[PDB]
Design a protein around this ligand. Structure first.
Ligand SMILES: Nc1ncnc2c1ncn2[C@@H]1O[C@H](COP(=O)(O)OP(=O)(O)OP(=O)(O)O)[C@@H](O)[C@H]1O
Ligand SMILES: Nc1ncnc2c1ncn2[C@@H]1O[C@H](COP(=O)(O)OP(=O)(O)OP(=O)(O)O)[C@@H](O)[C@H]1O
Ligand SMILES: Nc1ncnc2c1ncn2[C@@H]1O[C@H](COP(=O)(O)OP(=O)(O)OP(=O)(O)O)[C@@H](O)[C@H]1O
Ligand SMILES: [Mg+2]
Ligand SMILES: [Mg+2]
Lengths: 390, 393, 73, 247, 101, 70
């Protein structure tokens, strides 16, 4: 056997093993043989063997998707274009009211007289619907420390104006609508963005700059245009471009053509942001390690109105970060976290989290279950000093 | 099988024992009652004939369409093969866990209502990147590292073996390990070993294999590579010869280097970005590391960084006896005489010496390999050094 | 025939055109250089030709091609 | 102007002078050169590259150069930089002679030239000289001598060397078949013929695709000579005969 | 072709004529060879010479030809080629234009 | 796809050319301004077996063509 992990190890192992056996036994005693035809658990062929399927197949006919192209005369008469089938001039069934149908919206029509019965949501590139956040992160504004003025500005530009419009509307200030976050790698940009996404109360979209380069000409611009149309359907949304330097490259066309399609997509984003077509309720963020490369047209107010500098944290912020990350630990009681803050010279958040984890490591390798000071000193050594030359 | 989570301390304890004993006892009551019912009545006939009703509802000429958007409410837009787009009703017997956009759905012929789904191929890229067992050898064939292998084991293997250790204290494992050192020193081999020894799906890629000749293909490749790694449970990725893709990132450059930088940004986001990386680890190798980008090898992206020195005096003996292991040698083999020289030999150099000696032994028909052959082979292999002798010294 | 506005970024270009649309009454059409580039060969030209056709058919009108530098290289 | 500057005299990020490395890379393609110091002579054996039926015969040689009455040198690299360096060497020899009325010792000279070359690769912004030298001579300090130089400015005394094409192979045999202190001039010439026959893999010694030099002391004074056609061909016939008897 | 003939001898006739030396010496038997160079340099002539001298069959295919129309025709051709080479114990395959694939 | 369909036409041409018995008097002649850009699969024996240069005229041909056209 082994050294002995815990007194109950064997007892829990036994209860798990017989749990597995009883689960297998019920599996055999209930059937549930995997079916290659995608068919539900027999206890879930429910309303399915009968009584809803047989009641849904009778009244619910098959409508066919069609894309309205024109709505001529006040009298209902609709030209729809069924995909790869035909193109017709049809009328409205009674269920839909005339106001519901507009030009350009997908509609459903029946298979006999092709009259309109239901609208439908527009078609969005599968690669442009996933950038919605769906499940929001849990990081919050207590997890970001040593950046207090920066977070204040970000919160006053992306967050406060949506929650309390009347403050700004009364005095008559249209709040800035863009932020450029720039600072050394690993200083707190993406984390503050995560926090903003968690706290905010409106649609959030994550776009990577490297996600807008495409093989076929004139696709990236379409992607940007669709993204902004989608974001404009919502009531209010935030878009957070990462590594925007990916496609905001400076314009240097000369001689043989080089990186020109990226330039067209960049111009399309520029025109979407601030341009003839009004930008509705949208707020934009960008993060870059290298803000200089961004072109003169993007970095201009009206598109990126604010510029927040993230600098390496000061000593107070250093200890604060140490303490935030050393929270869910099984750690000793008294650690002079000021000592640890001093002992690491200018170092970023990533340094500090690495310090915490390396201290946990040096605790484990010593077969200890509570982290002490010596663990943290060893951690700081192994992190700062040893990995200096990189 | 969709069992309850104990969510006691999760570490061996009395509460984990009582929440565990309770589920066991309920399963016991259920099993007893079920066995009683089965003895009292088979129900085989009743469970049957439900298949018959289902197959009655789904007519014989079932049609394979292609789902394209689920309205979230037991409805769908299913596209027939030609290209038409219908708006059908999802019935009650389709296992909805298997319904996602792009799935080959099985529709009714007259009514196209969704009545099933089908499996798909498993090789978008899974086959081409997964390496299976390493043909070279297991941890046995590697010697002299000891400390490095220990680091890797703790970084990538130990968090899979016994999560309790890390979990007990509230610290997550390191994120990624970058293997750096002089060429021919045991990086790729150690990755191969920790691959063939662990229990996850290990994927390997060459950096020059991410340099694509159509725009926006490198970023797609990296995005996919990190896309079929969460589909597959715990997973490991090893991007070898990364130097060819991650470089200092000098801005005064023209050509396809911009695409290189753009794929580097995609990777830099995948490793640590907006979303949570799930359960995956990232190993990397680079013979030349001083030239990587600070944001790629920064702490939260790659916590562990491993140096790989050359064999010094004795690891040379170990490697030599490892590669000479399978060959009949004459009883005059002065191996130390070959090792004692401080010729800065590398591991791959040792393999080259072994193979060349074996090959000339084959050339001369001789049933055994002689020391003179090994020394001649050593001279021949070292002959591939060159350079300007007085210069620089 | 035609008017082109050139000046450094943010020097007041699109705002004047927006104002002209605000005061003028003929049919306005907006656009963007990158909007006429399509993947399919022969689609950008069809876009342009149909746009001029609609402008012509719907009484006198103006077309505003912003970011003309996208296609005029 | 900094835009067009090449920076031919600046360190690389690992402390290696690149222009120097490329200069030494040029030499590895010119004619091979051989050094062999006997106990009673010194000898230079380079390959005659100017192998065309329409070239004319001029001068006492084509690659060997006299520098004093008691010193000669052969060149591998660029021909024009060769001429420049030869002229400066001649000037150095005469300047020493004028100051001291004694022939310039051999390491006196070789280090003067290499100092010029090194200085040239240290500051100035020029390209370095792409030439590597082999020398031969006698002086009352060390007797018969055989030195060598490189674009860097480093030199070295060699009992036997090879600078130029197929240098590795030539030095490999020279290591295998050199008797330190047990070599007559005749044996050294035969060893040269053999090694060169290997190296000049293109055909065999045609007695015309080769150059040989001998420096000896005769009647108390140095005598320098360039082997004629008859003796060279006779030596080659002797070499083939010896190899045939050996097989 | 003395140089290439001797080389191919030493690289193939050994695994076929004398498939013992490798067993004893423990050095794994080479599984194939690659021929490269400009066009028309006797590659097929040497392949045929070795196939005849080694008393083995010379199933031959061209990589260009391998790139046929039917989907999987390359895969099916490879499977058929190897199964037939297995039916003929003594065999040597000569994929001609492997570069094209 | 488009390139796939062109490759399909090309392969169909090769398959039809190879489908002869040397006993049917159906001959094929094709003209190209760039032979080098053709795929080699056409040039292989059994298919197209003659290439006929049509070089720019030399003196004698220039004289003959002048006389015949004047
Ligand atoms: N002020 C901070 N408080 C807490 N954690 C921090 C702080 N700054 C950085 N970190 C840690 O740094 C890790 C690195 O991610 P982060 O979002 O900070 O990177 P970043 O600054 O956006 O970097 P990049 O420039 O590479 O995009 C975060 O997971 C967080 O753990
Ligand atoms: N300590 C060692 N034990 C066993 N084999 C070794 C050792 N060191 C080197 N080798 C040999 O080195 C060969 C080269 O493969 P390896 O995976 O070590 O390369 P690498 O160090 O990753 O090289 P590169 O830097 O070019 O990527 C392996 O086949 C193995 O035989
Ligand atoms: N002379 C001006 N009078 C009034 N507003 C001005 C003037 N110059 C610039 N602006 C302001 O500039 C802001 C942005 O400029 P705008 O986009 O209209 O200019 P542009 O030259 O068309 O820019 P771009 O090159 O980005 O298309 C507008 O909100 C407008 O208020
Ligand atoms: Mg390596
Ligand atoms: Mg504008």
């Amino acid at each position: 056997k082994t050294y002995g992990q815990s007194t109950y190890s064997r007892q829990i192992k036994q209860v798990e093993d017989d749990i597995q056996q009883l689960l297998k036994k019920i599996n055999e005693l209930t059937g549930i043989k995997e079916s290659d035809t995608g068919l539900a658990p027999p206890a879930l062929w429910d309303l399915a063997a009968d009584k809803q399927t047989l009641q849904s197949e009778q009244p619910l006919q098959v409508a066919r998707c069609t894309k309205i192209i024109n709505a001529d005369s006040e009298d209902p008469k609709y030209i729809i274009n069924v995909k790869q089938f035909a193109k017709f001039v049809v009328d409205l069934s009674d269920q839909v009211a005339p106001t519901d149908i507009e030009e350009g919206m997908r509609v459903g029509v029946d298979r006999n007289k092709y009259q309109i019965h239901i609208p439908l949501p527009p078609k969005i590139d599968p690669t442009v619907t996933m950038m919605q956040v769906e499940e929001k992160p849990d990081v919050t504004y207590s997890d970001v420390g040593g950046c207090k003025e920066q977070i204040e500005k970000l919160r006053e530009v992306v967050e406060t104006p949506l929650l309390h419009p009347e403050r700004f509307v009364n005095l008559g200030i249209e709040p800035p609508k863009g932020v450029l976050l720039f600072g050394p790698p690993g200083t707190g940009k993406t984390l503050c963005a995560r926090a903003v996404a968690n706290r905010t109360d409106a649609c959030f979209i994550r776009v990577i700059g490297s996600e807008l380069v495409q093989k076929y000409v004139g696709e990236g611009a379409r992607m940007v245009r669709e993204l902004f149309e989608m974001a404009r359907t919502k009531k209010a949304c935030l878009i957070f471009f990462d590594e925007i330097d990916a496609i905001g490259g400076a314009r240097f066309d000369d001689g043989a053509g080089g990186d020109n399609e990226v330039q067209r997509t960049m111009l399309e984003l520029i025109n979407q942001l601030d341009g003839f077509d009004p930008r509705g309720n949208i707020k934009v963020l960008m993060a870059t390690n290298r803000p200089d490369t961004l072109d003169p047209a993007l970095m201009r107010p009206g598109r990126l109105d604010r510029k927040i500098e993230f600098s390496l944290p000061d000593l107070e912020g250093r200890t604060h970060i140490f303490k935030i990350h050393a929270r869910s630990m099984s750690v000793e009681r008294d650690i002079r976290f000021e000592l640890l803050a001093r002992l690491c010279p200018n170092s970023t958040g990533a340094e500090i989290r690495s310090v915490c984890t390396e201290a946990g490591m040096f605790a484990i390798r010593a077969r200890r279950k509570i982290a002490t000071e010596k663990d943290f000193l060893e951690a700081v050594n192994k992190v700062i000093k040893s990995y200096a030359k990189f | 099988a969709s069992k309850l989570p104990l969510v006691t301390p999760h570490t061996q304890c009395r509460l984990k024992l009582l929440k565990l004993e309770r589920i066991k006892d309920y399963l016991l009551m259920e099993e007893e009652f079920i066995r009683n019912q089965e003895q009292m009545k088979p129900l085989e006939e009743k469970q049957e004939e439900e298949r018959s009703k289902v197959d009655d509802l789904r007519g014989t000429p079932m049609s394979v369409g292609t789902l394209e958007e689920i309205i979230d409410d037991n409805h769908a837009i299913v596209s027939t093969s030609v290209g038409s787009e219908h708006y059908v009703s999802i019935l009650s017997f389709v296992d909805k866990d298997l319904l996602e956009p792009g799935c080959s759905v099985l529709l009714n012929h007259k009514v196209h209502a969704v009545i099933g789904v089908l499996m798909d191929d498993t090789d978008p890229l899974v086959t081409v990147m997964k390496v299976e067992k390493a043909p070279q050898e297991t941890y046995a064939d590697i010697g002299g590292l000891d400390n490095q292998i220990q680091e890797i084991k703790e970084s990538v293997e130990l968090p899979l073996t016994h999560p309790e250790y890390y979990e007990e204290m509230g610290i997550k494992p390191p994120k990624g390990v970058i293997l750096y050192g002089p060429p021919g020193t045991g990086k790729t081999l150690l990755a191969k070993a920790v691959a063939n020894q662990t229990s996850a799906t290990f994927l390997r890629v060459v950096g020059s294999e991410l340099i694509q000749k159509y725009l926006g293909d490198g970023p797609k490749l990296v995005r996919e590579l990190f896309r079929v790694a969460e589909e597959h449970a715990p997973s490991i990725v090893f991007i070898d010869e990364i130097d060819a893709i991650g470089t200092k990132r000098y801005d005064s450059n023209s050509g396809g280097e911009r695409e290189i930088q753009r794929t580097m940004l995609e990777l830099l986001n995948q490793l640590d970005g907006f979303d949570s990386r799930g359960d995956v680890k990232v190993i990397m190798a680079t013979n030349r590391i001083e030239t990587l980008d600070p944001a790629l090898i920064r702490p939260g992206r790659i916590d562990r960084k491993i140096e790989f020195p050359l064999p010094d005096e004795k690891t040379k003996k170990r490697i030599f006896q490892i590669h000479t292991s399978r060959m009949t040698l004459a009883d005059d083999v002065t191996l130390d005489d070959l090792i004692m020289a401080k010729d800065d030999l590398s591991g791959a150099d040792i393999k080259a010496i072994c193979t060349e000696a074996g090959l000339m032994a084959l050339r001369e028909r001789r049933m055994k390999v002689t020391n003179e052959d090994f020394k001649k082979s050593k001279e021949n292999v070292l002959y591939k050094k060159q350079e300007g002798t007085p210069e620089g010294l | 025939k035609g008017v082109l506005m050139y000046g450094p970024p943010g020097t007041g270009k699109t705002l004047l055109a927006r104002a002209c649309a605000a005061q003028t009454k003929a049919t306005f059409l907006k656009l963007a250089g990158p909007q006429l580039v399509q993947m399919f060969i022969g689609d950008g030209a069809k876009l342009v030709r149909d746009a001029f056709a609609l402008a012509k058919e719907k009484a006198p009108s103006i077309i505003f091609i912003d970011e003309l530098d996208a296609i005029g290289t | 102007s900094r835009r067009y500057d090449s920076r031919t005299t600046i360190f690389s990020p690992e402390g290696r002078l690149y222009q120097v490395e490329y200069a030494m890379e040029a030499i590895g393609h010119a004619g091979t050169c051989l050094g062999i110091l006997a106990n009673d002579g010194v000898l230079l054996a380079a390959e005659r590259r100017n192998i065309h039926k329409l070239l004319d015969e001029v001068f006492f040689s084509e690659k060997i150069y006299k520098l004093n009455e008691d010193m000669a040198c052969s060149v591998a690299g660029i021909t024009s930089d060769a001429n420049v360096l030869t002229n400066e060497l001649r000037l150095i020899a005469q300047r020493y002679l004028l100051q001291y009325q004694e022939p310039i010792p051999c390491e006196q000279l070789v280090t003067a030239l290499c100092d010029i070359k090194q200085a040239y690769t240290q500051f100035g912004g020029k390209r370095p000289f792409g030439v590597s030298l082999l020398y031969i001579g006698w002086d009352k300090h060390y007797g018969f001598q055989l030195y060598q130089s490189d674009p860097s400015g480093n030199y070295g005394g060699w009992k036997a060397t090879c600078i130029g094409n197929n240098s590795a192979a030539a030095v490999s045999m020279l290591k295998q078949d050199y008797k330190e202190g047990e070599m007559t001039l005749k044996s050294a010439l035969a060893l040269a013929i053999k090694v060169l026959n290997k190296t000049m893999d293109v055909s065999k010694l045609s007695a015309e695709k080769v150059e040989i030099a001998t420096l000896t002391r005769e009647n108390g004074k140095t005598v320098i000579r360039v082997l004629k056609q008859k003796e060279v061909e006779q030596l080659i016939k002797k070499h083939e005969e010896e190899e045939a008897k050996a097989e | 072709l003395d140089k290439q003939i001797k080389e191919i001898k030493e690289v193939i006739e050994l695994p076929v004529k004398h498939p013992e030396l490798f067993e004893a010496l423990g050095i794994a038997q080479p599984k194939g060879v690659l021929l490269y160079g400009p066009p028309g340099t006797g590659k097929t002539l040497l392949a045929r010479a070795v196939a005849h001298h080694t008393d083995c069959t010379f199933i031959r295919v061209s990589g260009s030809e391998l790139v046929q129309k039917f989907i999987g025709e390359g895969a099916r051709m490879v499977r058929e080629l190897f199964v037939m080479a297995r039916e003929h114990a003594p065999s040597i395959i000569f994929m001609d234009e492997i570069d094209s694939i | 796809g488009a390139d796939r369909e062109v490759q399909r036409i090309l392969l169909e041409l090769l398959n039809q050319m190879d489908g002869f018995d040397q006993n049917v008097n159906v001959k094929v002649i094709m003209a190209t301004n760039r032979a080098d850009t053709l795929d080699p699969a056409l040039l292989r024996p059994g298919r197209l077996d003659r290439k006929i240069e049509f070089p720019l005229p030399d003196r004698r041909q220039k004289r003959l063509i002048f006389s015949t056209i004047t």
